Ligand binder design. Sequence first.
Ligand SMILES: COc1ccc(-c2cc[nH]n2)c(O)c1
Ligand SMILES: COc1ccc(-c2cc[nH]n2)c(O)c1
Ligand SMILES: COc1ccc(-c2cc[nH]n2)c(O)c1
Ligand SMILES: COc1ccc(-c2cc[nH]n2)c(O)c1
Ligand SMILES: [Zn+2]
Ligand SMILES: [Zn+2]
Ligand SMILES: [Zn+2]
Ligand SMILES: [Zn+2]
Lengths: 360, 360
Amino acid sequence: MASMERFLSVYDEVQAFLLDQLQSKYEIDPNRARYLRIMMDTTCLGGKYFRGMTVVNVAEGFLAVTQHDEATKERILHDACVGGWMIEFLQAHYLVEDDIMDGSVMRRGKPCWYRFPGVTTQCAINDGIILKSWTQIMAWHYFADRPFLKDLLCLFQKVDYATAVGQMYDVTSMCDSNKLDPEVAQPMTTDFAEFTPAIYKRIVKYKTTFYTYLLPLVMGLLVSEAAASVEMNLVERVAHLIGEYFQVQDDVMDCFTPPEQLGKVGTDIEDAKCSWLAVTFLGKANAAQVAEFKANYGEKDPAKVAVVKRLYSKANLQADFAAYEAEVVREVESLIEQLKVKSPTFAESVAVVWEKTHKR
Amino acid sequence: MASMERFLSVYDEVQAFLLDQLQSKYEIDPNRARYLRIMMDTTCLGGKYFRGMTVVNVAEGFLAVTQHDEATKERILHDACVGGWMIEFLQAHYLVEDDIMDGSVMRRGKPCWYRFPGVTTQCAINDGIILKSWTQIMAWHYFADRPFLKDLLCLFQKVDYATAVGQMYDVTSMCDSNKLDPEVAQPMTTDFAEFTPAIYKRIVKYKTTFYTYLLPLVMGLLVSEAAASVEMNLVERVAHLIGEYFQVQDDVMDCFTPPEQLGKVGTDIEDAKCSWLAVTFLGKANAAQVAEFKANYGEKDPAKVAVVKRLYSKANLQADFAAYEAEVVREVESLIEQLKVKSPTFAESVAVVWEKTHKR
Ligand SMILES: COc1ccc(-c2cc[nH]n2)c(O)c1
Ligand SMILES: COc1ccc(-c2cc[nH]n2)c(O)c1
Ligand SMILES: COc1ccc(-c2cc[nH]n2)c(O)c1
Ligand SMILES: COc1ccc(-c2cc[nH]n2)c(O)c1
Ligand SMILES: [Zn+2]
Ligand SMILES: [Zn+2]
Ligand SMILES: [Zn+2]
Ligand SMILES: [Zn+2]
């Protein structure tokens, strides 16, 4: 079976399980089951599934070099798919709640979930809650007897928590730290002294890289019982490196990729986000360029946004991006080499992850 | 040590643990640690702690009849307190997100968390997320080596999930089921045919009773290694019965307890909630009374709200409440008797829970 066909079929299985359980144990009625089915589909489907399919791809790499009965190969692939869906549902949770938090308009060429007419924020917050609850239901049901259940749940929790910490770092990135205070409405920074590479790296590390790269990789290992074919410190280093890059790309596309192509109108400039573009601009700007950035950043006025975009283009950030990209390629190749020492197989999956990221 | 002194001290311990971990492992800075400390205090403290102290009280009952080294007694009490805080933080999660979902104004005589000037919804949704993530961090850290870790995590998950299902039943209780549809803005029901005792019971069972009564009771058992001193089906029956009652009280106070005393301006009438008062009114009203209810319920206009309140008073619902209360007392006494067969101790804790509920 091709991997994607298998992955999508398990989605239907998992869906039917969750909805059937709601009828047999939770007293749901058909109409609310239908609401949840449509919520699930709308929030979990339609992306490229690279998080969830990474779990599958890691597990397939190990299958090709490990002796197993056919039943065991099927069981391992089924587990990789369920694990993959846990990650996809965890992302769906994030995206639902983030969209509400940020007052987002579109996601993937469609309205954000909370903006559907029959949803509203009042339901959507709870819908996002359920999305994450379903990850746990999956794990407890499908992995009940599995030796990796404990490690998998613990890993999941830590990644989840890192992710929520990262959302806090992200939504607070345009405040001055010493001014954070729940009793006082938070002004945007005037100095941008916290728009640094180290601070940007901290935001992106927690908000994206743990769930997008570390979790799929380590889940692949756990469902394969292969965590001893790797030096976990290298797996973390390479996840954080590739994850940072992925985010830098995301940050550039927010500003420069056409809305029709991005699936949304990017608003990082208006939201005063600590983006790669802002940090890199401030790292090379002269005093006049910095003053014009401060007078125009974080404003809804389209004229000021166009002025920030012009400031980025004139500063030739595409060159800083190339240099960044070169250094990442260098370091990713290095870590892949270090990973070959203990597992060629896992190194190869990491190469594939890098290819999918670098060439998207 | 008195139970409450112990419980509150463990709060300080757990707080310091969580904040210290954020500095050592999550790269937090002092100011964001301070934000989280104040969030924690504001959202987790200030109630009566009957959920969390139930865990302690169950565990203390078992200590009085089970032989143990002094170190083991301290360890069991410490675990009961940590478990109790897991439940309190889980409630804090619910309350933060529910307040945002419902556009609530006050909670416990103070602004809802999201309404603090330096919070906003954008942070508060995530703050609520973290609150629940901290429950898991507690469990994995404090119960790492414990034999009950698995059962406790599994129990927690199921209760959490039941709770989120119950929030969906609650916020959808004024829609007609057959009209639920994420593509279509949801009209309030005109017939109120779904305002029935069985439907009300389903809402309250999931939204309140699993986390408020079932979880504290069963956690008390688990940290005591005493789950075989009870018939779990009786524990569930008695939790659901007492929990229903607790909610009925809550529903009556929303309408009739002065705002200064309730700690908020109750809005169940305006929100068209499926409350005990509405269901009981519709169960006894004549055709004219039902028509006047339909023309005035679920409206912000204070005149219509005063008309619904008058309709409840004239219908002598305090009498239906007494009869309900009598039947609950009867059934609770019966279940306590059935629980004595296997554990006098646990039966007594359940009597105390009932006393605290019935006499609040
Ligand atoms: C774990 O590896 C990956 C690899 C690539 C991507 C990707 C490419 C376009 N969107 N997402 C990902 O989310 C995870
Ligand atoms: C002015 O800033 C930029 C920076 C980077 C890029 C980029 C990177 C890969 N493709 N395009 C860009 O289009 C504009
Ligand atoms: C598990 O037992 C209880 C007993 C009583 C209460 C109560 C009384 C006033 N608020 N809450 C509770 O939340 C849980
Ligand atoms: C008109 O409806 C009611 C129903 C019940 C009560 C009640 C129950 C315990 N104390 N008070 C009430 O004050 C008004
Ligand atoms: Zn966001
Ligand atoms: Zn972005
Ligand atoms: Zn609510
Ligand atoms: Zn209420």
